[PDB]
Symmetry: C5
Subunit: 257 residues, 5 copies
């Protein structure tokens, strides 16, 4: 228990985030684009695995996918880049602790979400260019997954987005509470294993699901309207999980009253 | 060997726990709610695994479940939050060592148990909201497990609770005896793998098994009366394991006499 | 750093006898914990053994070896007293004139009996869970306890030698590093090797026999068979830990 | 975030590389040959795995190959040797940051690529001498892979080269951002898993694919022309991924404006 | 870098080895016996695994064996004991760097090789005494492997020995280049996985394969002449990999060009 010091670090991180954005939109957006791309890389890997194992009829598909997703947030944390979903916890705890304003929070949320999407778009374009989703099990895995995501009821997506960002943000929280980089990566691995395999939903990961499916001329299951519907529901859920649960929660634990 | 140093750390932790509760019930209960939910997240994952592998008739089911439970206690330790089962050893050692009273101990046990339950209930509600236990093998795995859990004889549940909390508290004990966060997680991973795969029972984990079964309209196998029966039996077993083995044991090892 | 390592072994031996001389209760409680922690590893890998044997898997013994690390990891991380590690520590310390032959036999006897107490307590409580009432796990304990008790003395003895070379070398590694993670990894590798290769650990066997004798489910064991196995394996363990690891580390480290 | 410190570290590493080369072509080329060989060693392992599992008809082939390739970059990083693909990010960031010139960069690129190729040639010769690709599934895996790699469309290989070197360079970037050797190896393990299993292309790894295929008297439909074609397309993609994405991006993050 | 400091550590390690040997033949040979035994322990495990999975028809056999061999060199490195194959790189680098003589090197190589053999012999006898290779698939795996190893052409064995000791010595090299014991062990795990699964040959591991064959009554069919032939070809390959690739390689990386005080890199 060093909840107070932890809240101090979250607050200092929120302050530094808005300071960076005020200093340089380009640096901020570039950082955000990296993080979106790094998360998408995890999606490329586990959807390749999904295609390979689904084709085979394996019962381990979802387990292997969850075990293999760690790289997504590991890369974000180890490169120090800006991820929308972690910003839900960091900005809300900072705002509650009076380090940043509500306008700082919406600004960081908006720019990091958009920058993240830019990363996912760039990745999607390059991945299609590889020819790796022209035809076959990986293309089909993207196609079928994107369509099921776009047709899932709003309540289901919302609540899955809540549980997802509790796991993502708590993995970010762990990284603020240890000085061991290996422990950070292990905690990320566990949290991402839990969230992927349990069936929870990450807004930024989903950007790459849709970017690949939409840019691919051979994937014809989904549509931009579908992408928006899914992303809105999941983003809202992520926000509630990261800001209302983790942000508020860590403020309560840490605030010297 | 460092047994005295270890007892001194346990004693300090006990003192700090009761001081926290006395200072702020809200901070104490929020921490307890977090721990209950973090442990439940482990349940959500391994029961999803349960449902996936049982439906497939796999012999590795229980082994993969044990291997995948580590997140539950790893989150608790890395976030510094309040878990009832760990408090059995810490408060008992601290009490024997005259750092805290019997009343402090009973108070910490009651508040952390109830707070853990709040966390489990909240998690259950949100998990049911995902639509992930509407129907299918995961819902069925919850429903079948919850039914067999509340129909097991008291004595079997009690003894399963003892062995479970020897393992949970010894992994907490290890965390008091190393400065390496990675060693802490590895020891937690081993102990949780042992207790889940061997078939031991954790009261706080069971809260989430029962919260999901209670909230899901598709799960109609267990009853409030049965959940209560299981929880009492297992809580009592956990208490004997944590306080009478680990608490008393570590006091005996460390006390300068 | 062989000299420094021998000094650490010698200091550890001196601390063990000083502890036993100061408090039999503290010493036996530490030993009981260690016996119970090793036994917890057996409950886990025999559960695994029951599950996979039932499935006719070819990976049974490999998964069992990979999954046993907790046994010595707990002992090392809790600083508790394990008979088998004491075979190397006390012999190195005795050769190096930190402790006496009589101190060594005394530590060996107390830690062996303390470990046994931990195994018995564990066996009783595990039987109480109802988890070996019937089914593949109960059958795996019963069948393993039976085959262990019928193996020829010489086979058990040599298996005990190789087992304690591996257990004591993992303890030796723990004296040679300041990294707790490295300690656990080396323990994991050594227990993997010894379990999967089919070697025998006296203290682990105490839990095998405590479960088997406390479970009312019918086996072909008997107390005579259990004692037979424990004696043969204990003797092999002593040779592996004291004559190989203890003498060897003394030779490497002694400033002559 | 420590983006400025990181950019400074990249720049210092670029200055060190060109100073090394200017000091001794022998030392520089020997270092480069080692790295080419270390990478190639990863190829021998995973192609042996490819052969064994492909022969068996396993659906896990590409997954186990990805999991098993970590040694390639782990050796390079832990030995401090010169790898062409890593040099794409490092020299470009250092050049942008005015620590080295464009001429230095192209010189480092040329020497490290040729040096890496020398190490791949030596490895291939020696591996063929073992008799391990005289015949059988491993020999056939080399022969069929080499052939399919050489007949892939230019654009496909190019985009595959881009995504590969984003992953290789970001794992190198991680090594500059932590002091933990274990964390370095873990991130490398993750990045190499992702790039191999997803199907992306590494110029230096391909040098060993082709050295083995061409030196082995057991017959394929490859040819020197096919090898060069593949190596050029993939090298160009690696340069873009390493220099235009990672080099430029890390410069933008770290540059004080 | 840091090649110069790595060369210094190699050189100092070479100096300490010959000093130890000069000081006490008994200490040096006991250290070597330990290392031979520790490596052999890796063999007993992975040949047990070999027997289990071969009998079962698994295609994962050689992969699982490679994954499970890490203990062999991890024990050597974590106990600080004397392994012939590692000494190929260490003594050659230190020799090139003028810390030890050619005679020091040949001596360390001779004593460590024989010492390693002693440990493998002791291990083989004790392992046969367990009765674990009286009959069955593990017995057959040891026996079949021993026979096939003794009948492989010299050139194949030689080249396999080169690649193996590049891997073993590079893992020893990583251990000089880090202060993290866990990193040392991970690099050892990766290098041994690569060398075992790829099919490369280790002289000291082969000593235990043959010692188990020597003492197992359930047939040898192999021949002392055959074992010797295998051991010589693989030992020579190992020497080339460790000394000519790794030893000379690390000397070249590490030696500061001023000196010149004899010779000229360019
Ligand atoms: C590639 C260019 C990306 C530009 C993304 C800009 C997104 C702006 O987003 C807006 O930012 C405002 C603060 O300026 C906030 O007040 C608004 O809530 C928010 O919608
Ligand atoms: C949601 C509100 C939760 C409040 C839980 C308080 C329950 C207290 O419960 C009681 O606490 C006493 C000390 O105060 C102890 O002595 C008793 O053993 C315990 O039953
Ligand atoms: C629970 C009670 C267990 C007590 C175990 C005591 C076993 C004593 O054991 C004996 O101790 C003597 C010194 O006291 C030594 O001289 C002997 O070598 C040793 O066998
Ligand atoms: C034995 C191997 C020797 C390889 C030496 C390669 C020399 C490369 O030299 C470099 O080539 C670049 C393009 O290739 C040019 O842009 C540089 O001007 C030139 O210095």
């Amino acid at each position: 228990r060093a909840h107070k010091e932890t809240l101090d670090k979250l607050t200092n991180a929120a302050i530094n985030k808005i300071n960076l954005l005020n200093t340089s939109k380009v640096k901020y957006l570039v950082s955000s684009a990296f993080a979106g791309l790094y998360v998408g890389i995890g999606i490329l890997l586990i959807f390749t695995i999904g295609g390979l194992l689904t084709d085979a009829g394996s019962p381990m598909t979802k387990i292997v996918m969850g075990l293999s997703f760690a790289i997504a947030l590991s890369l974000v944390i180890m490169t120090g880049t800006e991820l929308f979903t972690g910003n839900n916890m960091v900005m809300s705890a900072g705002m509650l602790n009076k380090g940043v304003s509500i306008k700082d929070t919406s600004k960081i949320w908006a720019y990091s979400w958009v920058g993240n999407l830019i990363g996912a778009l760039v990745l999607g374009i390059i991945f299609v260019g590889t020819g790796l989703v022209d035809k076959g099990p990986v293309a089909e895995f993207f196609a079928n997954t994107a369509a099921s995501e776009a047709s899932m009821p709003f309540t289901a997506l919302f609540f899955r987005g809540i549980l997802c960002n509790i796991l993502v943000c708590v993995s970010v929280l762990c990284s603020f509470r240890t000085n061991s980089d290996t422990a950070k990566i292990i905690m990320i691995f566990l949290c991402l294993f839990a969230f992927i395999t349990s069936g929870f939903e990450h807004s930024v990961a989903n950007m790459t699901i849709y970017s690949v499916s939409l840019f691919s001329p051979t994937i014809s299951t989904v549509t931009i309207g579908g992408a928006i519907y899914n992303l809105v529901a999941v983003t809202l859920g992520n926000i509630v999980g990261g800001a209302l649960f983790m942000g508020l929660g860590t403020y309560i634990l840490g605030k010297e009253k």
